[PDB]
Each structure stands twice: as C-alpha cells, then as structure tokens.
Design a binder for this molecule. Structure first.
Ligand SMILES: Cc1cc2nc3c(=O)[nH]c(=O)nc-3n(C[C@H](O)[C@H](O)[C@H](O)COP(=O)(O)OP(=O)(O)OC[C@H]3O[C@@H](n4cnc5c(N)ncnc54)[C@H](O)[C@@H]3O)c2cc1C
Ligand SMILES: Cc1cc2nc3c(=O)[nH]c(=O)nc-3n(C[C@H](O)[C@H](O)[C@H](O)COP(=O)(O)OP(=O)(O)OC[C@H]3O[C@@H](n4cnc5c(N)ncnc54)[C@H](O)[C@@H]3O)c2cc1C
Ligand SMILES: NC(=O)CC[C@H](N)C(=O)O
Ligand SMILES: NC(=O)CC[C@H](N)C(=O)O
Lengths: 611, 611
C-alpha cells in the first residue's frame, strides 16, 4: 500500500534517507513523508550479520558472531554529526573497541614472502629493501612513513594553508594546496609521487602495503586520496557497535516506523506536474507473493539519498530532467561525473574456532587489525564471537596502562580464550583486486558446509554464499598469509561485491551500488557539493557519494545536513546538539565511553583500576 | 548540405562504415547512401601521421616520418577479408615489413632493472628467478613460454575440440574448451592461472612482461584473452603500409567520394516513422565557420558501424529503441554489455635523430619491436624516417637468409644509417597503465619545442601535443629503459588516449572511443554477434567491438560482412575474392609481396639474390 501524495518523498533507505526522515519527523514536525527502497532491506552500505552458531563445545546453547558486509568502524573525533546521532539515539551504551593491531604480530605477505609486522621493523626495515628494488632515499624507513613525510612536505610548501583535522581541513587541503603550481585535486597520487622522484618500485610497495590501491591507480585525485590515507594513523582508537553498525539504521527505523518505509519499491523516474506543482514519481513494487506492480504518486518535495550510479539512472529516465535546457542538463550530467566510483568487496568466512592463534600456528598469535598482502586478498581482518570479558580486555588495552602481573596474566587467558570460540575473517579489498574475485564468485557452484543446519539455525536474509571457487582460492592465500599448512573449511560464507551494476539480468538480492566514492581529478568539490543540494526546485540530493567526507557515514550525514538546511531550515545536527547540551558531541561521547569502559574494566579486568 | 532521404544511412566513418559504403556502391549498385561522421576526420581507430621534417643535415629539403596514433600492423594469414580488401584496392604495392625484434637487443625493464632480451636468456633465464619470487616449476623457463605451455595443456584436456588458426578456431576455443568443467569464457585468465596453481609472483611477471596487462586484470574472459596472447608468436612477420594504415581508409574515401561523407555530423538519435516506414535520424552538424546546426532526415536502411560506447549513447536517446517492449529493450541493452571496453593509448615522441643506437648509448643498438617494462610505459616501439633502402634491408631480413660478408656488411651500414635520420618512439600501453598518463596529459601546459616551425612545416590536424608533464616523465622512463643518461627533448609530440568519454565539457577533437574491446565473462558471443546484425528491422550494427576478431581491422570487416550478408545478400569479401580470382586472398597477397620484396632486395641489398 503506497500513499497518494506525501509532503516529502525519500528515495533510498540507506543512512542518508533514514537520517533525513528522522530529523524531519523530530525536528520539523513533517510526518507526511515516506521512504521508498528498491531492496528488501534497509540501511544501504551498512550491513551487519549476527550468526547464532550452535554451541557444540563439550560442555541447545548458542554463540553469536557479529560480522560486517559493509561499514564497520568509526571515530569519536571528526564525526561530530555521527556522534550526536549516536548520543540522541541512545546508542552509546553499545559502543565497543575496534582494535587495529596485535602488538606487531599482524601478518604481511609481499612478493611471495610471509612475515609479521615486527619482522618488517628488523634491521632498519631491511625486508622492504630486499623485496623491493628501492632507491637509496627510500630504504631503511617504514613504508607508511613515506606517505607521512610526503604529507609533511606538501604542508611545508603551502604555508598559506589545526588540532582536529576534519572535513574542512581536507577540503581546503585538496582545493588550496598545490605542488609545482598545480593544486592537489588536479593531481593523481601516482603522478604526484613520481613527480616527487619516487621509484616505481617504491610506489608499488606503497599501494600494495596499504591494502587499498585505489588511492593510486583509480581516477581519484591526490588530495582526496590523502584524506583517506591519513585517516588510519598508528594510534587510531576505532570503535564499533557490539551488534554491528546495523545498530544505527535499525535504531533509526524503530524511530521512523516501518509504515513510512516501502521496501522492494524502486523509484523508476520522476516528472513534474506543472499544474498542481508536484513531482510525479514512477515506481515498481514487488508484493509479498512476488508479483510485481507499477504505480505512481506525487510529492511536494523529493529527497534522493542516492550514490552516483543510482542518480545517473534516474537522471536518464526522468522527464523532470530530460525536459531541462540543453546547457543545464549537460552541465548537471557533467557534474554527476565528478566523483569517482570505488569498487569494494568483503567476503566473510566463519569458522567454528579460530586457527590463527599460536595454538594452531605455532607462531605468535594474530588478534586484531588488517593483515595486508599484495595477493588479491588486499587485507584480512579477524572477527571474534561476541564476549563481554573480551571487550573489557580490549577496553583495558585502549588505555595504554601497565598491567601488574596478575592483570597481565588474566589478559593472557582472555587473549587466548577467544581462539576456542567461533570467529571469522574478512577479505576487504578494492580497485585492482576486485576482478579476481568477481569472476571467481560468479563461476561454479556455491559453497555450503555439509550439515549446515546442525550449526547455524537461522541464516540471515542478506547472506549470499561465497562460490566454491572463492573459498578454494581464499583458503590457499590464507595458508600463504598466516604461514601455516592448516586452514580448515569455513562453516559459513558470505560474499558481497560493492560494484554498481547496469545489467537487468541480475536479481535484486545481488544488485549493490559502488562501495565508496572519491573526488575525481579536476573536480572543484566546493562547487559540486553546493550545486547538488537543490539542483531542481524542491528536488534534493544528499549522501556519501558527493560529501566532504567520502567513505564514511559522517559523509552521508553532512551531505544530508545541507539538504535539511537549504530545504527545511535545520542547522547541522552537531550544532543542534551543542546548543541543546552545552557542549560538543565529541566531548559528550568521550565522557560517556570513558565511564562504561571504566566500569567494564573494574568488572572483568582489574577490580582495582584507577583511570 | 545533407540529403532529404537516402536508401542507406551510414553512421560512423571508421573502417566499418567506409567498407560498407564501398561494398554496397560497388557490389550492390546502391549509390543513394551517405556516411555521417561526428569527428573532423575519417577512419576511426586507424590514424597515421606523416611529418615532413626540415632536412637540417649539413648537406629546403624534407624527410618524412610515418607514425601511428592507432592501428599499425596486420598479417597475411587469418585476415583474408582484409587481404582481399588490399588486393581489390590495389594497395599491396605499398606493403612494407613491420619487424618485431632486434636480434635480442630489445630492451626490458622490470622491478627497477634494465636489461636486454639476450640478457634474459642467460643462465637458464636466471634473471626472472632473481626479480620474481617464482615457484620452482616456474623458474628456468622463458615467461612467454608459460602462456604457451598453458595453451597446450588447455588443448590437451579438450580433445573434443588446424594449420591456420583464424576466428573460427578462436570462437570455438573459448566457447567449447573448458577447464575444471567450466568453459573458458566463464573464466578470467587471472583466475585460470591461479586455479592452475601458478604463483601470484609468476602471474604479475606474465602481465608485466607481456606489456598489455588487460588480458589478466580487466573483466575480459580467458578465452578471448588467449586469442590476443597467441597472436604474437616469435616468428611473426607483421607488415604495415609505408605511409601508414591510413592508406586504407583514404583509399576507401577516394573510391566512395567525399560528397557522400558528412564530417562534423554527429547522429544524435533515431526514430521510426510508422507511416512511410523510414527511420528518422536526428543529428547535429558544425559548418566550416564553426556555427552549429540541428537537422533530421530519413533512410530506409540504417547502418551503425559504432563501438559499444557509441551504441549505448544512441540506444539511450532514440525513440526507435525506447518504444521497444520492456523485455526486448532490456535484453538488448544487456547484450550491449557483453563486450568489455579496453582502454588503450599511444603517445608519440619524435626526435630529429635517434638516440638509442649504439652510437648514442654505447650499448647494443635497439632497432625494432616492443621494449617492454613494468613502468607505466608498458611497451615502447621505435619508428624511423621513411627510406627505401631500409625497407629493402628489412625485406631481406624477413627471409632468414645467410648473407655473405659483402651483403652482411652493407646491411650493417644500413642498420646504422637510420639513427642519423629522424625517428620516433611510441608508448603503447593498456588497462592498468592508462590512468597514470591520463592525469599527466590533462595537467599543466602542453609541450612545444621552441622554434617549432623551423622544423616541421605543416603539423597534421589530428595531432594533439603531449602535455609538458607527459614528456617529463616519459623522458625519465626512457633513460631507465634504454639504460642511458642521455635522452634529449622531442622535436614533436602527440598524445591520444583511446578511452571513451561521457563528458560534454570535452572538445570534439579530444573525444575518442575505447581503443579495443574483448568479450566479457559469461558472454556467449555466437548469440551476441548474430543478435546484433539486424537487431531492429532494417537497422544494422557492425564493427570491431562485437566481432570474431576483436582488436584488429579484420574484426570490423567480418562483422560488417554479416550486415552486408543479411541485409543486402553479399557473401564474404574473401569468398567473393576467391570466386573472382581462382585462389584465396592469402595466396594472392603472398605471391604479390614476394615479387616486390624479391625486386626491392636485388635493387638495394644483394643484386645477386635468388629466393
Ligand atoms: C565495504 C564498505 C565498508 C565501509 N566501512 C565503513 C566504515 O568502517 N566506516 C564508515 O564510517 N563508513 C564506512 N563505509 C561507508 C558507509 O557504508 C556509507 O558511507 C553509507 O552507509 C552510505 O550512505 P548513503 O545513504 O549515502 O548510501 P547508501 O547506504 O548506499 O544508500 C543508498 C540506498 O538507496 C537505495 N536505492 C538506490 N536506488 C534506488 C531507487 N531507484 N529507488 C529506491 N531506493 C534506491 C539503495 O538500495 C540503498 O539502500 C563503508 C562502505 C563500504 C562499501
Ligand atoms: C591503439 C590501437 C592500435 C590498434 N592497432 C591495430 C593493429 O596493429 N592492427 C589491427 O588490425 N587493428 C588495430 N587496431 C584496431 C583497429 O583500429 C580497429 O579494429 C578498427 O579501426 C575499428 O573499426 P570500427 O569502424 O569498428 O571502429 P572505429 O574505427 O572506431 O569507427 C567508429 C567511428 O564512428 C564515429 N562515430 C561514433 N559515434 C558517432 C555518431 N553518433 N555519429 C557519427 N559518427 C559517429 C567515430 O568518430 C569513428 O569515426 C588498433 C586499435 C587501437 C585503438
Ligand atoms: N576506501 C574507503 O574509503 C573505505 C573507508 C571505510 N570507512 C573503511 O573502513 O575501510
Ligand atoms: N590489445 C589489443 O587487442 C590490441 C591489438 C592491436 N592489433 C595491436 O597492434 O596492438
């Protein structure tokens, strides 16, 4: 059942569409809105899974493993809009550490060699000079520090151009700093380092050892690439939600109501009734028996919270756009082209127990963070069965305290216990590595462990299994990476390739947009962003794909915030938060987390902890 | 001035549109046809340049250098349609060797190491085991032979599945041979070698050392990739035209008439007048003062000789297509998607003299063929000022004769003389290397040698100069590749990036389609090809992009030949040739070339030559 006419139509039930709805309901009384979503699920590029494995330990019990098919981490600083969102939805009590290292034990596979992070530090970083035919100025330093030093040189040469480095910083950085008279957004990073005199060997080392080579090889420009590279310092304290990033959209859905959200309802095109001055949205819904329907309705205001690919599709097919003048239609198409599509993927393999601990490898145990490799892997992130004690031990560790032997010893048993509970690995890769897995996942039968109901009762709806080819090659690279003969067969598998599709012969449950976007070369994104708020009268665009903060949910909320500003008069949520609370969302979130971490620690770790 | 109405409208003045016109005029009396071309030049992806440098040797004389901005080589076997075309246009007297090696002196740059082909043979191919962390089964053999052996294994395991290996062979190969129960066109080559057990090191070696990595990393499927890899054996005797591949389209234009060809006339869209049963083609022409015009005309039969990208553009914007039923419109869009777009580029740098001969390097001289590298270069091909004696010496060399010292000694002076005349290098790269040059060519001022009229009188219309950034980095890689401190500044430069564009803010003289295409994964190209001959009634498609022989002009002529068959009753030109001549075009072209080579040799090389 679909309304006649709504005050605002919301196209897209990702984070951008949901956020708009909740803010207009709550902050603007607007209750005559509805959300139209083409998939059978809400939340878009945020997609968590919770598997209740059958406890089949010697001892009808269930053990839950959280995992991510999309978004996974966030930060307390630089995401004020997202922090305020958390604080206002009362979700901060679920916030849990996302750790990024294992004390140097994380894995590294390059040029047919498997080793650890601590290994790579040996001997003035000798191994890198041995695997890569580096220039003298490029030897004897840690790879990541090369990107670091280059950043510092860029800043030294642009004095014309700050403790917390947020989207303002990153927009001005790429739009105002230059190199050899050319500003950074007219540069590719690949051309940048080369022009700076780095060897091609060094440059391949950089994009292989950073796991995500699109920053170098894609058409994305150097300035936005840097924004991404300097988002993962050594001392990052990422956090996540215990039950997954889907906590946030689900929490938004409860507070919107499933009755204003219309699933399996793709908005096909939009015209504008010149008479009663209302947009007219042609759509296609599948009902619950699976029998299609094609309708149409009006709306005074239209909100498209859609990425680059979806927006071109509507633009092509909509009378509201075609009947625009040649110059403005072509100008507006042209500025759609100014953000580059970044494919991403994540393939999760669950195991009844974890085999990368010292008990199973005979090598120093791997715990948390990315295991990088120049194999199609890109990077590999371990995920563990949910467990309160473990998060407390992780919370103790975010504090760089000095445990006394009693507490150190208990942290040991905790660090080792997790290997006995179920767990999973994610292969998270980008640009260059995608095609390898593409062809793999679409060829041959799909993988299923035998007796797949004897462990795992419900299997979530959003889980498409990895192809048997994908598991096969993933199992061989894992042996390579973790330097062990022993990698068993997954209990469960999921594959998800965030790469937009233009083929009609693809089911809905397999159609997914481009995982991330990043500003293209030559793209003045100050003009692009502002021209895409209200490009037609009362028709708005918002979302991550053309934000200040590409690749992150904060990007979606800031881009939506401009829509809620220009079309509805709401100021930025972070500014709203401060006025109502007398302090920032950054400050409020830290104080709140400190208390829960403080508790969790005295409860499980050191009952005598003092901050 | 543009006709009311023609019997056949030809959209595209590349090789496919020109060939259709000439065959319908000549073989079918149809003279009420006209060609509509969006650019200011005929010929499409065939684009030769001829520069008359000012002879400024000590001694108003001009020295001409042929070069290629697109297509450059062909073969006497497997291109029967193209050979018959040559023989019927009387162009065989201009056919000249295109050599592919320099006796082992060609260059190789990999992992920061410059060396020669003869070097790589040393010591059971030792250098490859030293640059690449190869598996034991992958050491001690020449890289190219790995692709060779893998081919032979594929054939061994498919006995169900031939002296001259033409398009029939290659279609059946990829559509009927399988590996692990999956036919080759359901495979990527990357996944294929991996599943066969090759190391990732080995696989990076293969796609770097073959210069054109799209065969591995693009979405093209394994079978078509092989067709391309086994098109360059060791013993290839490529030939070209002395004045360039543009000889062929120009020769077609003379025999069509510039009066039936309409340049700067883009066909914008096509509808179908249901009344007088005629297609109706909306267009846009620029006149000779540069003032636009938008007209329209009819045609009984429409011939689109256009690649994948151009065909989608019309499909989107044409009432003849939109008003098709949902299922057939979406089916036909879907099968447009079944050939993968392969970007290509070629950047030519001309020099008053050649600096890679032993006189300028102190190293064994480089002569002909690809100098490969894992640098963004991809490959580098030397081009020399035209010179009759040189082609005779090259013709002597296609015969693997054994010169007596007199003749050997004269071939020496000839081999060395060319370094003193002007010459040029082409950087010919693909897939992964494109973006590097992209950003380079679009940033900063464009390169011009000072006093650029004091040598080079006319500069051809199709020459866009390389950006000053492109020359800068090209000059540094050349020093790397040719292992010399000394690489001077080009006298003239051209850049041309065969990568389709969707931006309106691009001039016409910079809009170029995708350089080549290759069959995607999952694409049964027997069905795709035949469904795209006459997809609407009396509206036809032909060209390279969906041919049996992607990447070559023979592909365009065979795909057009199906259009001339189904819509007009003409049999294949090669079959036509045989009936009229009593023998093949392969046989006739070899006998003709043998005679001219036989002459040329006795004239310049060994006046006592016996075949
Ligand atoms: C692999 C991956 C990992 C990530 N990790 C992180 C992370 O750790 N931290 C972080 O902060 N961010 C992360 N992100 C980014 C985050 O997922 C996004 O920034 C954000 O979720 C996208 O918000 P959006 O609403 O702009 O887009 P989306 O979430 O993609 O919303 C678009 C929605 O519109 C729907 N839609 C499309 N067309 C139509 C139509 N015609 N009619 C109706 N509905 C339509 C789509 O189905 C989808 O539901 C990650 C992204 C990916 C791909
Ligand atoms: C770098 C490179 C090197 C190559 N080397 C070789 C080689 O050595 N040997 C070989 O055999 N082949 C080679 N080829 C392949 C060869 O160039 C092509 O196979 C062939 O020339 C293309 O023929 P076509 O007519 O199918 O396409 P095109 O030549 O591309 O013809 C398309 C034409 O249609 C025009 N057009 C497009 N849209 C419209 C419109 N709306 N209205 C009007 N006109 C329009 C375009 O401007 C163009 O003129 C090479 C190709 C490239 C890119
Ligand atoms: N490459 C990107 O922009 C992805 C960033 C994303 N937030 C992540 O966790 O990886
Ligand atoms: N990669 C391709 O298909 C290009 C082939 C083309 N005939 C050439 O000379 O390179």
């Amino acid at each position: 059942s679909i309304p006649k006419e709504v005050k605002v139509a919301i196209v897209g039930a990702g984070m951008s569409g949901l956020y708009s709805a909740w803010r207009l309901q709550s902050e603007a009384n607007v209750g005559d809105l509805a959300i139209f979503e083409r998939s059978d699920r809400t939340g878009g590029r945020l997609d968590s899974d919770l598997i209740e494995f059958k406890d089949n330990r010697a001892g009808g019990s269930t053990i839950t493993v959280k995992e991510e098919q999309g978004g996974m981490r966030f930060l307390f600083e630089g995401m004020d809009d997202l922090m305020a969102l958390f604080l206002k939805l009362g979700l901060e009590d679920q916030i849990v550490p996302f750790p990024m290292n294992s004390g140097g034990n994380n894995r590294l596979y390059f040029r047919g060699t498997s080793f650890s992070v601590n290994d790579a530090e040996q001997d003035d970083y000798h191994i890198w000079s041995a695997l890569y035919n580096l220039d003298p100025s490029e030897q004897g330093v840690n790879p990541k520090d090369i990107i670091n030093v280059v950043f510092n040189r860029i800043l030294q040469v642009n004095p014309q151009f700050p403790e917390v480095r947020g989207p303002e910083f990153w927009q001005n950085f790429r739009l105002q700093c230059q190199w050899q008279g050319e500003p950074l957004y007219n540069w590719s990073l690949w051309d940048l380092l080369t022009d700076m005199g780095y060897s091609q060997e060094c440059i391949t080392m950089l994009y292989r050892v950073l796991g995500f080579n699109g920053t170098f090889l894609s058409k994305m420009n150097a300035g936005v690439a840097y924004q991404l590279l300097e988002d993962f310092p050594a001392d990052v304290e990422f956090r996540t939600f215990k039950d997954g990033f889907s906590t946030l959209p689900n929490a938004l859905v409860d507070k919107i109501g499933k009755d204003k959200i219309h699933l399996q309802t793709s908005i096909d095109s939009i015209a504008f009734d010149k008479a009663d001055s209302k947009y007219v949205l042609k759509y296609t819904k599948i009902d619950q028996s699976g029998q299609v329907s094609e309708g149409k309705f009006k709306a005074e205001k239209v909100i498209l919270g859609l990425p680059r690919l979806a927006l071109e599709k509507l633009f092509i097919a909509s009378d509201a756009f075609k009947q625009l003048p040649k110059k403005r239609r072509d100008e507006l198409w042209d500025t759609l082209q100014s953000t580059s599509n970044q494919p991403l993927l994540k393939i999760n393999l669950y195991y009844d127990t974890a085999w990368w601990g010292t008990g199973m490898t005979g090598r120093p145990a791997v715990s948390f963070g990315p295991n990088f490799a120049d194999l199609p892997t890109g990077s590999v992130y371990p995920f563990y069965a949910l467990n309160d004690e473990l998060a407390a031990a992780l919370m103790y560790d975010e504090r760089h305290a000095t445990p006394n032997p009693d507490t150190q010893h208990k942290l040991d048993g905790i660090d080792a216990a997790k290997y006995a509970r179920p767990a999973a690995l994610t292969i998270y890769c980008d640009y260059l590595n995608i095609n390898f897995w593409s062809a793999l996942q679409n060829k041959g039968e799909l993988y299923h462990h035998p007796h797949e109901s004897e462990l795992v009762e419900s299997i979530p709806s959003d889980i498409f299994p990895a192809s048997e080819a994908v598991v096969q090659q993933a199992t061989q690279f894992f042996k390579d990476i973790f330097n062990t003969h022993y990698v068993p067969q997954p209990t469960l598998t999921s594959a998800r390739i965030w790469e937009g599709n233009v083929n009609f012969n693809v089911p809905e449950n397999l159609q997914f947009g481009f995982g991330v976007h990043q500003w293209a070369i030559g793209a003045n994104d100050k003009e692009v962003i502002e021209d895409l708020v209200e490009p037609l009268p009362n028709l708005f665009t918002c979302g991550e794909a053309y934000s200040d903060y590409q690749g992150w949910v904060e990007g979606a909320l800031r881009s939506t915030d401009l829509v809620l500003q220009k079309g509805f008069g709401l100021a930025p949520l972070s500014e709203v938060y401060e006025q109502d609370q007398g302090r920032s969302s950054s400050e409020a979130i830290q104080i709140a987390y400190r208390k829960i971490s403080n508790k969790m620690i005295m409860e499980y770790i050191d009952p005598n902890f003092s901050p």
